[PDB]
Amino acid sequence: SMSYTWTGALITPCAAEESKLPINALSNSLLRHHNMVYATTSRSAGLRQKKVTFDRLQVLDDHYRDVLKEMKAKASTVKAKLLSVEEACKLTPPHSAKSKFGYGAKDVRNLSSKAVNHIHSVWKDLLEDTVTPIDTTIMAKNEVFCVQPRKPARLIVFPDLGVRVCEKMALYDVVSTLPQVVMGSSYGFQYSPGQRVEFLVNTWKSKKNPMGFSYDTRCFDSTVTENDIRVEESIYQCCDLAPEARQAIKSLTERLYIGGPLTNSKGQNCGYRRCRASGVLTTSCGNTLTCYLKASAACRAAKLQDCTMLVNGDDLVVICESAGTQEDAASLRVFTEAMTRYSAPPGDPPQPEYDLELITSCSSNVSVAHDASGKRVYYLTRDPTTPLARAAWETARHTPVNSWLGNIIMYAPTLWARMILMTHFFSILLAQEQLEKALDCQIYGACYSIEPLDLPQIIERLHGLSAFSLHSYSPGEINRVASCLRKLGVPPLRVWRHRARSVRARLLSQGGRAATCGKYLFNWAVKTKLKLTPIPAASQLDLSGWFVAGYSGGDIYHSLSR
C-alpha cells in the first residue's frame, strides 16, 4: 500500500513564486541577514514527493482494539446536525480557491444561485454515487523559513470549492464537537495558550515523579492508511446523525478521504493518493483521533503508568509516572515499537524529559516568568526564528495572511512577541495610518479577521492582565531569543526597548484605543510603570469558537465580532 503513486507530471505553480526576501527599508530595520530567509516553491516539489512516498505496513493488536471500542462508546453520545447551505457558505474564506465550475468564494458567500445550484448538484451526486473517486488538486505550498545549517515545499491536496462546501454541511458540526467528547482533556484544540499551559503544568504537578516526552511521527499524513480513514468514519457514524448526513459522510469517505486522483494546476493527472489529504475539512479531526488512538494503544503496550496525553493533530505530548531513568528509556523504545507497528514511525526517536520546560510540542514549550507581584507565572513560548523570518517577509511583501498578528495573539506573553513584533508592527501601522484596518490571521487553522486596535482586549481575555507585566524571564529563554537575534541579524533587545518607548509615546498621543495599545502593550518599555486595570470593552468580545477545535487545511473562516 503506497501512500502515493506518480505519473511523472510535475507539480506546477499557479503563478509566479518568490523564493527570497526583497531588500527594503522597514524590513531591514527588523532583520539584516535577508539571505537566511526563504520561501518554499514548486521547484522543490520533487524532493517532497520522494519523502512522502512510501509503503505502509499496519499490524493491530488488542490494545488498539480496546481503545477504539472506548472511543466509539463516547462518540455514541454525540448528536450532530447537518449544516444548511447558507451556514456552510458563510464559513467559506473570502479568498478560498475558486471552483473549476464558473464561480468563486465571493459568489458562495453572496449565495449566488449559480454557486448554490452547483453546490446542490454536488450534494445530490454524493448521495447517489458512493463510488467514483473525487478529483483533487495537488499544490506546493509557499511558506517562509530561515536556513538552519533549506527544506522542500510541503504539498497540499484539496477538492473543488463545491465539494468543500458540502464537506461543511455534512461534517462541520461533527469535527467541531466529536473530538472533545471522545478525547476529553487530551484534545488540544479546546485550549487557548494559557489553558494549555495550565493543563500541562497541573498534569506535571499531579505526578509523584513525572516523566514526559513529545513524539513526532515522520510525515504523519502519509502514514495514515485507508483502514485508518475507514476507522475514523466508523467513529463519525457513531454519532446520532440525520440519514442524509450519514450517506454524505460515507460517500465523502469512500470518494475523497480514503484516496483519489491527483491533478496539477495545469489539469494534468499527477498520480493517486491512498493516504490523508492535507486539505480537507476532516484533516485535523481525523489526524487527532488517529494519533490519539495509536498513542493511547502504544502507552498500554509500553505499560506506561498514570499516562496523560495531549494531542493536536499529529503533535503528541505524554506525561506519565516515571519508573526510573533506565526503565523509562526502555519503555519509550517499546512505545515507539508499538507506534511503528500501527504505521506511525518516529522522525526522531522520542526522549524522556524530567523538566516540563524541556518538552517541545506544537513548536512550543512552557516557560516561566514573574508578574507585577513577583509571583511565578507559566506561559507558552517557542523558538522565535520562524516567527521573525515570516515577520520580515510580511514587512517586505504584501501577504494575505499575517503570521505576525497570529503570533502576537498566541504568544503575547513572550519576550520576543512583546519587545519585537509589537514594537515593529505598531510602528508601521502608525506610520501607514492603518491601525483601524482589519487584517487576516490564522488560529488553529481557522482564518480570522482582526483589528490591531483590539489586541489589548484580546490579550487580556486570553492571557489575563499579567501578560502586560511579565518580567524576569528565564535565563534559557532570554538566551534563546538573544542568540536568535544575533543569528538573523536582528537588533538586540536593548534597541527594541528604545524603539518601543517612541512607539508608545506616539500611540498615547492619539488617545482613544490607540492610547490604550500604548498604555498596555508597552508598559514594559517605560521606567515608570502605569497601573494597569481591566479593560471594560474586553468582555464585549465574542471569543466563543476561537479555541474549540482545529481546522488546519479545512478552509474555515470567521472574523472577530464584538
From TrEMBL:
<comment type="subunit">
    <text>Homodimer. Interacts with host SPCS1; this interaction is essential for viral particle assembly. Interacts with envelope glycoprotein E1. Interacts with envelope glycoprotein E2. Interacts with viroporin p7. Interacts with serine protease/helicase NS3. Part of the replication complex composed of NS2, NS3, NS4A, NS4B, NS5A and the RNA-directed RNA polymerase embedded in an ER-derived membranous web. Part of the viral assembly initiation complex composed of NS2, E1, E2, NS3, NS4A, NS5A and the mature core protein.</text>
</comment>
<protein>
    <recommendedName>
        <fullName>Genome polyprotein</fullName>
    </recommendedName>
</protein>
<feature type="disulfide bond">
    <location>
        <begin position="299"/>
        <end position="307"/>
    </location>
</feature>
<comment type="subunit">
    <text>Forms a heterodimer with envelope glycoprotein E1. Interacts with host CD81 and SCARB1 receptors; these interactions play a role in viral entry into host cell. Interacts with host EIF2AK2/PKR; this interaction inhibits EIF2AK2 and probably allows the virus to evade the innate immune response. Interacts with host CD209/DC-SIGN and CLEC4M/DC-SIGNR. Interact with host SPCS1; this interaction is essential for viral particle assembly. Interacts with protease NS2. The heterodimer E1/E2 interacts with host CLDN1; this interaction plays a role in viral entry into host cell.</text>
</comment>
<comment type="function">
    <text>Cysteine protease required for the proteolytic auto-cleavage between the non-structural proteins NS2 and NS3. The N-terminus of NS3 is required for the function of NS2 protease (active region NS2-3). Promotes the initiation of viral particle assembly by mediating the interaction between structural and non-structural proteins.</text>
</comment>
<comment type="similarity">
    <text>Belongs to the hepacivirus polyprotein family.</text>
</comment>
<comment type="function">
    <text>Induces a specific membrane alteration that serves as a scaffold for the virus replication complex. This membrane alteration gives rise to the so-called ER-derived membranous web that contains the replication complex. NS4B self-interaction contributes to its function in membranous web formation. Promotes host TRIF protein degradation in a CASP8-dependent manner thereby inhibiting host TLR3-mediated interferon signaling. Disrupts the interaction between STING and TBK1 contributing to the inhibition of interferon signaling.</text>
</comment>
<feature type="domain" description="RdRp catalytic">
    <location>
        <begin position="210"/>
        <end position="328"/>
    </location>
</feature>
